[model samples]
Target: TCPFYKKIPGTGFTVDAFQYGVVEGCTAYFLTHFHSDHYAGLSKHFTFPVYCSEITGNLLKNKLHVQEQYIHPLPLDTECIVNGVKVVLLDANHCPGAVMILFYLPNGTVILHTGDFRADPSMERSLLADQKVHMLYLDTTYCSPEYTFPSQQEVIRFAINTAFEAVTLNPHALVVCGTYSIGKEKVFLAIADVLGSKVGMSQEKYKTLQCLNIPEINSLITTDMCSSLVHLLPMMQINFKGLQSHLKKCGGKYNQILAFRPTGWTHSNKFTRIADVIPQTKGNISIYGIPYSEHSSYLEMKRFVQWLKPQKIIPTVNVGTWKSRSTMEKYFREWKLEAGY
Candidate 1:
């Protein structure tokens, strides 16, 4: 229970919570991102003021109907005081509005929660690197060494090239891209610009993109499903069965379906490059898992810890076999000893 709802010994702030009871009575609230797992149980009926980036704040107001006063938009890299804690928000580089939160506790200890982020070179030179971190809540989505991925820019190039090559190979095929609601807008935007085609999205997703107001993305969106149009499907809705229904709705509008999933899961069980297209064929649909992720890989994680060198590292995701406290201790023995007072 404490894993999800732990209290700071000195600060009286609450982090993302799935259970409303945990958020109740807290002096303040911090939302790292708008991802479902990190933002579960949040609604408009709640009275607490939620602190996050302006983009995230907008989504909360539009999607959840949270009042304007209840949404505190913190500018990136700026320090602000709330609940007696000196807090700063830094770009997480995970998604459109993702951020890493840094808090200087009353006790003089600096705690950092990297909401969710990929490895970034600039973060090492940012203000966050100037202070020593006492405790770190890390995004350990790909904690194991097996998960090695390339940079986001490299993956975007690979995905764009792959999609164009796919469409060139089959002119009448519909290219279905798998992406989270807010994450991976870059991938589709690049494809649209390169292919000179409109990116199809649902009305809900279109509204989200409009809210973001990203000029490169807003002008390229459409709700129509026609030849030469790329459809942006929610990551969860890109599965084998889901694609069948989508294809049926097309009514043979597309001769073939090229499903591309730009995710880090491609690095699991086998090492893969950014451009490698490993296809999973189901009838007329060919699904390819591309190694593009918003979270750091094990190699990047090691470098980040070595650079930031937090006293203690607390893994965020409950990964397999390595999740137990004892195993984590053994796994992070070198880092744990440094943090041990």
Candidate 2:
């Protein structure tokens, strides 16, 4: 089984309550985000009160059909007490409601669980300026040095500007902005605003976006294809064959198709790399993978650790996937040397 929950014994505090059976004994369950992996085994039948951001709580209620009574919404940057443990929710910058949980333990140990977060400069400057972290449960999703990718905001700008420029050059071409089911709504919203059009997605995605309640973002429920020059489709549905099939049924005169996939895997030393323009395209249905990722890169993680200077580091993901804790310790040592501290 995957190790998901972090418990502070005798303190009655649990973060990212994993298994329903395991969490039954927990005092008050805290959820990092609405990601299924983080909330494994959680359902409508869950009895424990779940603590999370207001947006995450809304997603839990609306998307997962979780009862409102079971959810306890915690606002970002606010101090709150739960079962004698003082807690603060900081912006994780991963998704809409993802947060980094800071726990002030009864033993005076400050535990910082970076619940699936990307490195944000503002967060580092403000939230962690003068703090002593005892135990840091890090989101080591991209903890390898090869995982150097640009920030999500920069990549988002590149994607939007690239698509906008492409569409401007080829007015007859259809622009497809690819994204995940839940995250990456900003890409579609930006494209829609830039193009002065309503970006379209499936009915299910439409319902999910509706729960977010961002009125400025104009989106529609697409049937066969989206009814605009710019169409928002799932990242998996952005392939050549899929786009070709979609264009065939579009029933309109479109000269070309341009697709943008926002992901972190686009970075590598083997490729002709540009910080902003990740993957180069050479086809009619041009596909470019941008570096807009929600997870922190290896360098970012190193910098984070250097700043926090936690006494002990705890990798969040299972050791089976990460190899071992000693390996990460070596990486930490290497980073410390590189940081010259």
Candidate 3:
């Protein structure tokens, strides 16, 4: 077995070999964001207390519904010490609670860990430029050159246009999109904002939004505002089999139709192959596919590493557990990019 002394997230570091047997004994432990992958296996194994931004604290408690004792809230821009580690939280605009973490040890080592971040030009550049990053664990969920995302503005435009079109075509039609609760919900918010409309959110969405104290986006008028023209529906409420009958009942054309499904569902079991469903719906159904993700694309990941210019660029989630240095090295070579910036 390879004996790496660092706080390897995976395994194989026996008690005798690991300088810090508990693994939670590191100077600081930071959770970059509230995603399931990033926080998985921690609640059971890590008891030294977890650090996240205040925004994340509300999310963890209300959204994820985690126990209060296991969570600790650290506000943005303020540095806090937990379990002997100096932790700094930076505002990462990927989600309502996403944060870029900086952990500094007494020995002068600094690790910058971003759970899942978007390079929202307004926020990321300054922070990445300021820090002297020793090592970085990046988010590579969308690490590919083929993925080209339209701007948030363009996505909003598409959603508004598509929603209006769907309603106009079939007044009682129920359109459904499958997506996660975080980013895609925001897409709904953004779409609602532009259209001057609001749909009923699920209790879960309503609760989480309450924790964040986000007012019912004022710009979006209630569904009643357009009752005469369109019927609004949340994507989660629509059944797959009900679409045809729903569309028919509305009579071939009426504004009562509504498309309500999330557009981003990459890693979940709920994925319906676009090819399988798109043909059945015909071009009559508007399927909005946009590439607005929290993770960086392959080119963007490489670009981040290049910008960080780190002493050692370590990818932790997969490799730090697999003892697969060669595999990770191959990834760098595969991308034709060098590590450590």
The clash count of every prediction, one per candidate, is 1, 0, 12
- How far out, in Å, is residue 7 in model 1? 3.0
User: All candidates' TM-scores?
Assistant: 0.88, 0.88, 0.69
| Candidates ranked, most accurate by lDDT first | 1, 2, 3
lDDT per residue (tens digit) for residues 1-341 in model 2? 32443775556667776674754456777889878777777778876788999888888898788898998998888889877678889989888888998888787788888989887667777656767888888898877767776566666677678778888888888878786656777776777677777776677777777766566544433433446666777677888888888788777678688887766565353354545354445467888766667888878878778877777777876456445666777897876677665
Clashing residue pairs in candidate 2 (N, C-alpha, C atoms within 3 angstroms): none
Instruction: Give the distance in Å from residue 117's predicted Cα in candidate 1 to where it truly belongs.
Output: 1.9
Q: Candidates' lDDT values, in order? A: 0.77, 0.74, 0.53
Among these predictions, the greatest lDDT belongs to 1
Model 1 C-alpha lDDT per residue in residues 1-341, reported as the tens digit of each score: 43442444567676676455654457777898888888877788777778899989988999878889888998988879987679999999898888988889877899888888887777899988687898888887777766776777887787788778878888777888987768877877888778888888788887787766476554588776563378988889888899988888878678788888876665253754555556889788888776667888777876777778777777777543544555555657755465553
Model 3 gets an lDDT of: 0.53
In model 3, which runs have C-alpha deviations exceeding 4 angstroms? Answer: 1-29, 41-48, 63-70, 165-177, 215-239, 242-286, 317-341
